[PDB]
């Protein structure tokens, strides 16, 4: 559901969904083309 998210200061608004992209263990963000934040991991429970 559309919801404000504040991931350790990473502030944004959007619909968060169960991710299906494979972040390698050294990756904590996700960028699409034109640098749009497409996926994020939780700094607390480590969920993509």
């Amino acid at each position: 559901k559309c919801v404000n998210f504040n991931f350790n200061g990473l502030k944004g608004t959007g619909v968060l969904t169960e991710s299906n992209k494979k972040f390698l263990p050294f990756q904590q963000f996700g960028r699409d083309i034109a640098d749009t934040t497409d996926a994020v991991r939780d700094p607390q429970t480590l969920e993509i």
Binding site: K21, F23, L24, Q27, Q28, F29, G30, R31, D32
Partner: peptide
């Protein structure tokens, strides 16, 4: 005592996933 590194040495520079997009 010298030899060339053909293309070795590159690495993932910044830990922000990108799929199928030339960075």
């Amino acid at each position: 005592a010298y030899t060339n590194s053909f293309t070795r040495g590159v690495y993932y520079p910044d830990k922000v996933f990108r799929s199928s997009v030339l960075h």
